[PDB]
């Protein structure tokens with residue numbers, strides 16, 4: 001079996017009979033698939049529990065994901081292989097109004113309002129990979145730190161401080177947020193994790209056997225930024241948004257790092273230093289992507305590698321050879 | 330008027346009549362202070378709404394804060410000057426059991442369980458200053474970016490990478506988390522904000538007219554670390570936990586910066602670069618604290634300033650004079 005719990009936001013205002021139409025189609029199909037649960041409706045927010053055989057649940061949840069009548073869908077729990085059915089049937093409750101609101105539905109309802117509003121805001125400040133772990137029933141705070149091989153990614157906007165002395169502050173922030181959105185979408189598509197924003201810099205990492213994905217993400221970011229520059233409106237600062245990218249590979253510590261008022265699930269280790277130094281090297285090179293020989297050698301695809309001089313980095317143990325990609329330049 | 334909403338965690342297991350004793354004393358005193366609301370009890374979690382005149386509310390909430398029977402108290406909303414009383418009276422509900430659990434208290438109750446468990450975890454990953462803004466009824470996502478003068482603080486563990494090649498990974502993380510806990514407590518006490526952890530480094534900031542508080546925090550961190558080293562158990566790695574600290578002052582942009590899966594409320598600007606460079610300079614100096622002449626000159630107390638040579642930084646516009654504190658060395 002399987003039980004899913006999720007919360008979503010109205011993509012637009014939904015009338016009375018519109019939300020009741022939801023409940024009807026859902027009841028019809030869930031009854032067909034032996035799926036029980038409940039769909040609660042509050043002020044512009046949906047919450048729903050649904051349980052049944054994973055195949056039938058996986059199909060339904062995915063029709064729900066495609067539904068354009070709501071957005072910001074966050075799965076709160078994914079309980080794979082449940083032993084007991086929590087609900088005898090499936091139905092819909094519209095508590096936004098009343099439904100016999102006494103001294104026990106009134107306080108409950110406000111608590112759900114306040115908690116959900118707060119949860120929805122906290123979500124936007126939370127590293128994206130935390131939620132998934134919670135859905136799996138494992139508390140990410142209790143993950144023990146471990147040594148793991150990773151590919152570290154650093155990227156950093158070229159000449160940001162200039163944007164800052166030529167644009168109003170709202171426009172500066174819009175440029176940096178556009179950059180981070182471009183980078184985040186591609187890294188995440190290629191299986192990496194954006195772990196930190198450091199000023200105008202993205203720090204990310206990939207599994208240690210994913211050098212090809214890290215290279216592809218980096219090439220795809222460089223190409224997306226070239227398209228963004230070329231397509232920007234006339235006079236847009238995005239026309240001069242450039243980045244450099246550095247990649248390194250090594251053993252790091254992954255775990256919860258921080259204080260008690262705030263922690264991060266992130267990585268520590270020398271490969272972070274190396275990747276950042278390689279990224280900075282792009283300011284002295286024509287290339288916008290640099291990566292270590294360990295990244296080059298761990299890649300499996302026949303990339304158009306170019307060996308850059310012989311390298312002369314500092315702070316490491318050896319001046320490792322450095323590489324980029326030369327795509328018919 | 331005023332209405333407070335908050336959630337807390339059991340500091341220890343609480344029996345049946347123990348939690349009912351809560352409700353009795355609360356009803357007695359709230360009835361005396363014309364305070365209405367509700368106290369819900371779920372699995373090891375309290376939620377409570379309380380409303381009344383701010384003075385009487387401020388007194389009660391603070392007796393609640395001191396109560397050792399719960400911990401992790403987070404105010405979810407602080408509605409100052411409420412016009413209408415939301416509750417006619419005050420009472421307690423123990424929904425952990427039943428209280429007529431039909432097809433409408435059962436789903437509600439699970440949603441409260443799941444949401445609260447998720448909220449409590451997200452809290453530990455959230456920059457500490459986000460919650461406060463939410464309590465004030467202002468959505469921090471809607472804060473517009475602004476130019477503001479700040480004192481930037483950077484601190485960074487000396488020779489961390491060594492800890493990493495002499496200790497098991499659980500012990501390495503314990504050392505770094507001890508460091509961040511020491512720094513965070515003092516910065517926050519002195520009115521600053523820890524905004525980011527960058528590997529073994531703390532990034533923080535203070536109001537621009539708070540150079541004295543930033544200096545005091547830095548001196549207090551250095552003294553707390555000296556006490557920690559000296560008091561550590563025999564063989565403890567904390568005995569060799571050292572830090573450097575750099576402080577700079579300047580105009581930065583403060584606002585929400587990030588992508589759509591994750592943003593930070595933080596700062597951008599040159600003073601960040603300067604503070605980090607000054608922090609790094611402590612590795613070439615006997616001093617463990619360095620700060621710019623702008624920090625020195627904006628301080629109002631008669632600190633024991635020492636002018637360090639004449640400075641020769643790079644990347645800035647001028648090799649500004651640098652200072653530290655010499656306390657009868």
Ligand SMILES: Cc1cc2nc3c(=O)[nH]c(=O)nc-3n(C[C@H](O)[C@H](O)[C@H](O)COP(=O)(O)O)c2cc1C
Nearest residue numbers: 022025026029030039046050060063064067069070
């Ligand atoms: C909050 C919300 C919850 C929904 N829950 C379900 C559900 O549980 N089962 C289902 O079949 N459709 C559900 N839907 C509707 C589906 O997305 C989709 O419209 C439905 O499968 C259409 O069925 P049809 O192919 O017969 O037209 C939900 C829609 C919304 C807005």
Ligand SMILES: Cc1cc2nc3c(=O)[nH]c(=O)nc-3n(C[C@H](O)[C@H](O)[C@H](O)COP(=O)(O)O)c2cc1C
Nearest residue numbers: 351354355358359368375379389392393396398399
């Ligand atoms: C979840 C929880 C909620 C509480 N809420 C209240 C309250 O609303 N009003 C109050 O006077 N005491 C409340 N208390 C108890 C107070 O902390 C404190 O024990 C009480 O003021 C003692 O009153 P006394 O001075 O007469 O002994 C609460 C305790 C707990 C664990």
Ligand SMILES: Nc1ncnc2c1ncn2[C@@H]1O[C@H](COP(=O)(O)OP(=O)(O)OP(=O)(O)O)[C@@H](O)[C@H]1O
Nearest residue numbers: 268269270272273276486487488489490527528529
């Ligand atoms: N440029 C960087 N950006 C982000 N994180 C970094 C950077 N350089 C290092 N780190 C992180 O900091 C950790 C420690 O690196 P650091 O440069 O502080 O070395 P160290 O051994 O502590 O020596 P030092 O006395 O120079 O600080 C690294 O493992 C990595 O996690």
Ligand SMILES: Nc1ncnc2c1ncn2[C@@H]1O[C@H](COP(=O)(O)OP(=O)(O)OP(=O)(O)O)[C@@H](O)[C@H]1O
Nearest residue numbers: 157158159160161198199200597598599601602605
């Ligand atoms: N060492 C640092 N640690 C953390 N944040 C930094 C650091 N140095 C700079 N920043 C942040 O990055 C922003 C841009 O600084 P940066 O050094 O990237 O300059 P730039 O103008 O973008 O030039 P470049 O082409 O060298 O990257 C700074 O305003 C500051 O917010």
Ligand SMILES: [Mg+2]
Nearest residue numbers: 156157158160
């Ligand atoms: Mg930059």
Ligand SMILES: [Mg+2]
Nearest residue numbers: 156199200201
């Ligand atoms: Mg930068």
Ligand SMILES: [Mg+2]
Nearest residue numbers: 485486487489
């Ligand atoms: Mg260090």
Ligand SMILES: [Mg+2]
Nearest residue numbers: 485528529530
């Ligand atoms: Mg460091």
